[PDB]
């Protein structure tokens with residue numbers, strides 16, 4: 001493992017005009033303590049060696065770059081390869097970042113890690129990692145969410161995490177984030193706040209990317225050892241997560257002929273494209289979670305680095321309808337025997353619109369962020385065939 | 386990346402006095418052909434190549450031999466390593482076997498593959514490798530199981546397979562179908578208690594686990610483990626880990642199989658199967674059991690200390706290791722097999738625990 005040193009973000013956490021840390025003076029000291037501790041850690045071979053050991057032994061890295069022969073033939077276009085992040089522990093790509101942040105918590109001396117969770121996957125990713133290192137864990141979760149996520153709540157309790165219900169406001173992720181951040185600020189000396197999103201204040205965006213970058217670097221290597229060259233295009237779902245960021249960053253900052261990068265977002269309800277693309281075309285920008293970025297003032301935003309990618313021209317952003325995503329979901333399962341997370345099914349849907357036109361000798365990599373076993377019931381709610 | 390050529394069973398499928406099964410006259414010709422095809426397949430490099438390719442790129446092999454540090458410190462005894470079979474695609478170790486069998490069926494020119502399942506784990510495994518190889522898949526499930534397993538039924542359906550309705554009523558309905566359409570159908574069985582050559586075949590495809598542990602132990606310890614522990618029951622988990630060690634001239638690790646706390650349909654059979662029975666007699670493996678309450682405690686112990694939620698089945702072995710690892714020395718090594726992940730039994734364990 002080698003943590004990158006990309007030309008961006010800059011010292012202030014800026015990717016061009018995007019990024020930064022537009023936060024209250026109460027958060028500042030905590031964030032600068034973190035940034036400093038992270039800058040040090042990424043250089044230390046002791047940290048790198050340890051991180052690498054856990055990614056391999058615990059998370060199960062590196063993940064295979066799987067050739068979907070049936071998919072390739074079905075589309076009749078370029079050869080399609082799947083980066084199997086679904087074969088990770090917890091079942092999500094999230095763990096690369098959670099493992100990295102928890103390890104930095106231990107290295108900083110913190111004995112406690114907190115985070116917030118909506119659906120519950122993050123909460124489980126954090127609870128899981130805290131168990132590995134033996135850290136006290138508290139996950140803030142809106143009450144609404146706590147009732148429609150009994151399973152994941154039980155898992156967190158099994159992992160030994162304390163799930164702290166949030167009744168405030170509308171009892172959702174939004175509220176949980178406030179209770180959490182406040183906790184972290186008060187208990188900064190002993191606690192670390194684990195954020196898995198690429199949309200947030202510096203150095204979170206840079207840190208999440210760096211930890212997720214192990215995805216693209218593996219693709220870069222696996223490709224060179226497989227085709228003697230890099231892919232023609234990389235396709236991944238985008239939406240305030242981190243999945244695409246890890247795949248993209250190792251190629252975004254490369255010279256002229258890097259592979260084409262395609263971020264696929266969910267069609268904005270009442271729109272023809274996603275919020276990001278829509279913001280790019282309209283030129284509307286704003287601040288979100290102390291991060292300047294494209295904002296159409298699913299997620300309200302996709303992040304500063306993705307905003308930079310758009311203007312730098314290293315990545316284009318497309319969208320697909322809810323129906324096209326379900327079509328992608330059913331497709332992969334039927335042809336490859338792999339049930340992908342709904343997020344990834346979106347990437348599959350878009351690849352359907354561009355892979356067929358490409359040459360049969362070209363290579364395309366699609367990122368499978370996680371497994372769909374979590375989304376099976378939601379997809380089956382619309383029970384049919 | 387070749388297949389194993391173990392001394393047992395013999396040409397007839399017997400492990401000492403074990404193996405003999407009562408197979409109706411109309412099934413004998415299908416089992417003989419299966420033997421012929423299989424014996425011929427393991428001789429072909431191209432066959433071994435595809436198996437390995439898929440085992441690696443699709444299933445995710447090799448699985449890590451993980452050092453459970455917090456749990457080795459807790460028991461205070463020997464070092465504990467967990468063979469992470471829970472990282473495999475689908476979450477179960479049984480996929481080593483289904484991938485191999487669906488591959489055999491394709492080589493044999495079959496275009497259809499059938500199977501039967503209770504809770505649905507086997508149905509999904511089969512359906513998965515059926516979609517992977519473009520084979521037609523039909524899973525026989527009982528009316529009851531089908532209602533209590535809405536998820537798996539849907540999964541199977543998404544994988545493109547057809548689910549047609551107690552599992553007892555589904556097994557002998559499938560054997561019939563197999564016989565009638567044997568010319569075009571292959572029957573995937575994930576059990577080590579059926580008639581020859583299934584126990585040998587399943588053992589061979591599962592062997593990959595044990596062989597991996599053998600080389601992983603050698604590279605990390607320079608020697609083989611002191612004891613290997615695995616739950617013996619639903620599936621072929623313990624056999625895959627055991628076989629590559631059970632026939633070693635010596636320097637053999639102690640093999641400890643762990644067991645759980647009427648009517649025989651189709652090709653099912655009571656017991657642990659021919660090979661585990663032979664191991665016991667020959668004395669190359671010893672067996673034990675734990676109470677439901679003890680395994681339940683293991684489930685929770687591994688979740689809290691290692692961040693790994695095991696299958697209730699693996700929790701039985703965990704529980705058993707709890708009774709022997711602490712006595713041992715901190716310089717000794719113990720490998721525990723984690724057959725699958727417990728993200729399924731977690732709903733059940735959630736009930737009987739308030």
Ligand SMILES: [Cl-]
Nearest residue numbers: 242243244245
């Ligand atoms: Cl992203």
